[PDB]
Amino acid sequence: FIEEGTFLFTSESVGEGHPDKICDQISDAVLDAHLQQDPDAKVACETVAKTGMILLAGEITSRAAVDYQKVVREAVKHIGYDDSSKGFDYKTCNVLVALEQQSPDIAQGVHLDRNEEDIGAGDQGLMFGYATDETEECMPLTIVLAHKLNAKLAELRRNGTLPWLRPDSKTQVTVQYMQDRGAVLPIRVHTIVISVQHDEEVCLDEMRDALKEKVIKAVVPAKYLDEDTIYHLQPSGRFVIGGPQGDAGLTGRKIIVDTYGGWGAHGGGAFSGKDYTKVDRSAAYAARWVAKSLVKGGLCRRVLVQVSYAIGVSHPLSISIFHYGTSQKSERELLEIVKKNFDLRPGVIVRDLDLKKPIYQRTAAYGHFGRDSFPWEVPKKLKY
Amino acid sequence: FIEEGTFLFTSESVGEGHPDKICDQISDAVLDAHLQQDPDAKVACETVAKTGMILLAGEITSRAAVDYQKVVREAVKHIGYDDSSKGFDYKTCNVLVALEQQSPDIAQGVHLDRNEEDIGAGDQGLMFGYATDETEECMPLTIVLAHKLNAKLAELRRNGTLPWLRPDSKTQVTVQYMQDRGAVLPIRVHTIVISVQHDEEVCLDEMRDALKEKVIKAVVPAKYLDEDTIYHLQPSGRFVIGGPQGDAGLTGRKIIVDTYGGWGAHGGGAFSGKDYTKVDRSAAYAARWVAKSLVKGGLCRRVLVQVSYAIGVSHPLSISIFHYGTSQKSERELLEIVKKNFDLRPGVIVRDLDLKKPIYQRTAAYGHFGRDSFPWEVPKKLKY
Ligand SMILES: Cn1cc2cc(-n3cc4cnc(NCC(F)(F)F)nc4c(-c4ccc(Cl)cc4)c3=O)ccc2n1
Numbered sequence: 212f213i214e215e216g217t218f219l220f221t222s223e224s225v226g227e228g229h230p231d232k233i234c235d236q237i238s239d240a241v242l243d244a245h246l247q248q249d250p251d252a253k254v255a256c257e258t259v260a261k262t263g264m265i266l267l268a269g270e271i272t273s274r275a276a277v278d279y280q281k282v283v284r285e286a287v288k289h290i291g292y293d294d295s296s297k298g299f300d301y302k303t304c305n306v307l308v309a310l311e312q313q314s315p316d317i318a319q320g321v322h323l324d325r326n327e328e329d330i331g332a333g334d335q336g337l338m339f340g341y342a343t344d345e346t347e348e349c350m351p352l353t354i355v356l357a358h359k360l361n362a363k364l365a366e367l368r369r370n371g372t373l374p375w376l377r378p379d380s381k382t383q384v385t386v387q388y389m390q391d392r393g394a395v396l397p398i399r400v401h402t403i404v405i406s407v408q409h410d411e412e413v414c415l416d417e418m419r420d421a422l423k424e425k426v427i428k429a430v431v432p433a434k435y436l437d438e439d440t441i442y443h444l445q446p447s448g449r450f451v452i453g454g455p456q457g458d459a460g461l462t463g464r465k466i467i468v469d470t471y472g473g474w475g476a477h478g479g480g481a482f483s484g485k486d487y488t489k490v491d492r493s494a495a496y497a498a499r500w501v502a503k504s505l506v507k508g509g510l511c512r513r514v515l516v517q518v519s520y521a522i523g524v525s526h527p528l529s530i531s532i533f534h535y536g537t538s539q540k541s542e543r544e545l546l547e548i549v550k551k552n553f554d555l556r557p558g559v560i561v562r563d564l565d566l567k568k569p570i571y572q573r574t575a576a577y578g579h580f581g582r583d584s585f586p587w588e589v590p591k592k593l594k595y
Numbered sequence: 596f597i598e599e600g601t602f603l604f605t606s607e608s609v610g611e612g613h614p615d616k617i618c619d620q621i622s623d624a625v626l627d628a629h630l631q632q633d634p635d636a637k638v639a640c641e642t643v644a645k646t647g648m649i650l651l652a653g654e655i656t657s658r659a660a661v662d663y664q665k666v667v668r669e670a671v672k673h674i675g676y677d678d679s680s681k682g683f684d685y686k687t688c689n690v691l692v693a694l695e696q697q698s699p700d701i702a703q704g705v706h707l708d709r710n711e712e713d714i715g716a717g718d719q720g721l722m723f724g725y726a727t728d729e730t731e732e733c734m735p736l737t738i739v740l741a742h743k744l745n746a747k748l749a750e751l752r753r754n755g756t757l758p759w760l761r762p763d764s765k766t767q768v769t770v771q772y773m774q775d776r777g778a779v780l781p782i783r784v785h786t787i788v789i790s791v792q793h794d795e796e797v798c799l800d801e802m803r804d805a806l807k808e809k810v811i812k813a814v815v816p817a818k819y820l821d822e823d824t825i826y827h828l829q830p831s832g833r834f835v836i837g838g839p840q841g842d843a844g845l846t847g848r849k850i851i852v853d854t855y856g857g858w859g860a861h862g863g864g865a866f867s868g869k870d871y872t873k874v875d876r877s878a879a880y881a882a883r884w885v886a887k888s889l890v891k892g893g894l895c896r897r898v899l900v901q902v903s904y905a906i907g908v909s910h911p912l913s914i915s916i917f918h919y920g921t922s923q924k925s926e927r928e929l930l931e932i933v934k935k936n937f938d939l940r941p942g943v944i945v946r947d948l949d950l951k952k953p954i955y956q957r958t959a960a961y962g963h964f965g966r967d968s969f970p971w972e973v974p975k976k977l978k979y
């Protein structure tokens with residue numbers, strides 16, 4: 212039963228060994244390796260994963276000397292794919308590279324002979340930032356719980372207490388919310404899905420019991436779970452084949468997992484493998500920073516920000532703020548506050564958010580937002 | 596100046612030769628080729644494009660005998676990449692294939708020994724459908740105009756009137772809207788961006804003049820354009836290198852272009868290269884069908900629908916309808932109407948929307964929604 216004024220919302224997350232997420236992490240390991248040697252590296256590194264194969268494809272212009280074999284294989288090792296029995300092995304997989312320089316036509320139109328603050332956007336596009344006061348970290352509970360379920364699986368795999376676990380996993384959480392003057396209040400968890408790759412020996416009942424008792428109960432507060440919560444645990448019945456062997460991975464195929472779990476809005480751009488001149492990442496990070504600053508500044512409880520760019524043009528084409536009815540300020544007033552406090556040119560975002568720093572591999576699993584006090588998660592004190 | 600009660604929104608689109616879109620079209624050409632011979636083919640075909648290369652990667656179990664070289668090259672020919680001078684040539688590129696059977700573990704958990712109507716979802720995930728009465732086709736004007744600008748470029752390339760054009764293009768449209776009791780009314784076009792690949796001989800002024808006079812004016816009604824509309828036409832200054840040579844392409848990297856241009860919501864799943872058992876596509880198509888049926892049925896002016904699944908489970912885990920204040924019915928009443936009129940199991944969607952038919956390549960440019968009276972665009976007459 213859904214009481215009037217309440218509603219359901221669902222988000223998902225995936226683990227570090229999910230094949231798409233493998234690709235995001237490798238793309239960002241490559242980015243970080245370049246940035247460690249050349250803070251101004253121009254990087255657009257896609258990764259593709261299938262059985263036995265990591266392929267890097269894209270465009271990099273950089274003064275760095277990067278050992279792609281080592282970078283790729285160390286990222287896969289970190290994830291946990293270290294033996295043919297698990298379906299993938301960093302020691303013995305194929306690493307292919309189809310990397311060229313950045314197009315000179317892009318370079319000339321974006322950054323050649325431009326003052327850093329006045330570099331053009333590296334592409335056109337639209338980006339959104341979102342924040343919600345329903346959790347301290349200003350993220351939707353649906354996505355936070357989904358991420359934490361995957362993190363718990365990785366924790367119990369790595370600590371050896373559930374040694375039948377393997378790195379590829381997916382989770383999904385449906386929460387019922389109460390409307391509260393434009394904001395939302397979580398009531399209960401309606402449905403949880405967990406699927407995780409596993410060894411050939413463990414049986415379904417052992418896995419389902421462990422997923423409930425050692426994963427869900429260790430993550431989701433009991434106050435949100437009741438006798439009617441629906442659990443779909445290993446619903447396919449068998450998930451021995453996994454990782455890239457089970458399903459091809461590509462960079463930028465988990466963009467909703469990377470952001471807000473379907474809340475807010477999304478402009479379509481992927482984050483991983485891209486340096487700060489690619490506004491798909493830098494402007495989305497800055498828009499998150501704006502949104503979170505508006506909420507933590509007490510101006511909104513819930514807020515969406517849209518920005519957009521034209522390739523070669525530094526300033527956003529427009530900015531808009533939607534507060535869901537949760538501000539006493541008007542949309543015009545909030546925009547004025549944002550314009551007075553933020554400069555969303557990529558060549559200024561880079562300074563404010565320290566986006567030449569090689570921290571990107573850390574962003575590439577468990578969402579880019581709501582964790583670890585990255586610069587875009589530290590609210591700006593607003594003057595108005 | 597933005598009057599209170601009005602706001603800006605931006606969407607983008609890309610052309611048929613945009614490298615990500617090339618990949619979507621190839622993935623769906625492969626799907627269609629399989630379905631022409633085996634309506635029950637299980638297809639999960641990713642495409643990757645870089646200079647000189649189309650790679651197919653993924654999982655296909657099918658009784659069809661498909662000539663991947665021919666299918667790929669004919670799709671690239673159709674797009675218009677037919678000479679080294681354009682950066683890519685269907686006759687002479689490399690076509691690599693890394694395709695395996697569908698994982699038997701997925702097959703057993705999804706469809707093996709299951710009645711078709713009771714096939715499980717091919718994955719977990721969340722999907723949204725959206726419709727808006729602001730255009731006859733029930734799509735956001737921002738995205739419709741952006742698509743039409745790309746289509747116009749392709750038209751003028753193919754008819755030889757702008758022979759300097761090449762297949763890779765991007766467009767972006769910002770519209771100012773009036774709020775209208777939860778619905779939206781377009782007022783004016785605020786900013787247009789167009790970038791299109793071009794030959795080495797044509798100059799920037801000739802291109803910018805043509806883009807305004809022969810493309811924008813031929814697409815965007817004059818009533819929406821005024822002396823303050825901002826035009827960013829060839830803003831990078833030079834776009835001779837393009838297609839995969841300029842920028843790697845991957846399937847499923849234009850998911851917001853494929854859907855609502857940022858309006859509504861998105862669950863993250865990509866459409867192209869996937870048969871109907873992959874709910875990322877079938878359930879999103881069905882959710883669009885539901886949303887459009889609610890609007891065309893006079894129950895809403897604007898509506899968002901969320902559904903979600905667990906792998907192996909046929910019925911959606913939940914359904915929710917949000918009408919933005921544009922229905923006299925409650926959310927409970929709309930849900931009741933939807934449940935009485937629709938069955939969102941994938942093995943029923945396939946019948947209602949005829950999803951074994953090989954029409955998918957046609958969906959893979961210019962958006963999956965709002966055009967050509969595909970089955971999900973033909974509203975269902977609702978009984979209640
Ligand atoms: C006074 N008040 C009214 C309110 C209405 C509020 N609300 C109620 C909703 C009810 N159902 C659904 N269903 C899910 C759907 F099917 F749409 F996808 N979504 C809602 C959303 C919502 C819409 C789009 C997105 Cl991306 C995220 C959430 C919402 O914001 C919340 C607080 C309120 N306070």
Ligand SMILES: Cn1cc2cc(-n3cc4cnc(NCC(F)(F)F)nc4c(-c4ccc(Cl)cc4)c3=O)ccc2n1
Nearest residue numbers: 476515516517531532533602774775776777778858859
């Ligand atoms: C009485 N009434 C009130 C209304 C408010 C309405 N509205 C006003 C908006 C104002 N600004 C923005 N800015 C863009 C942003 F920055 F948020 F991304 N978005 C709005 C949206 C909107 C929110 C999320 C999404 Cl995906 C798409 C559109 C909206 O729905 C529309 C009709 C109304 N009628």
Ligand SMILES: C[S@@+](CC[C@H](N)C(=O)[O-])C[C@H]1O[C@@H](n2cnc3c(N)ncnc32)[C@H](O)[C@@H]1O
Nearest residue numbers: 406447449450457458639654697700701717718
């Ligand atoms: C279900 S697969 C997508 C469909 C697949 N490409 C096919 O050929 O049917 C998407 C993700 O689900 C997970 N997955 C893979 N095998 C699975 C299985 N046997 N059971 C449950 N989930 C699985 C992995 O995380 C994988 O990346």
Ligand SMILES: C[S@@+](CC[C@H](N)C(=O)[O-])C[C@H]1O[C@@H](n2cnc3c(N)ncnc32)[C@H](O)[C@@H]1O
Nearest residue numbers: 255270313316317333334790831833834841842
């Ligand atoms: C700008 S590229 C993304 C960045 C690129 N990977 C890099 O290395 O900087 C994204 C898309 O923009 C378009 N594009 C490519 N070259 C361009 C140019 N010189 N000017 C404008 N747009 C261009 C193509 O549609 C391409 O797929």
Ligand SMILES: [Cl-]
Nearest residue numbers: 229231458718
């Ligand atoms: Cl997936």
Ligand SMILES: [Cl-]
Nearest residue numbers: 334613615842
């Ligand atoms: Cl792009």
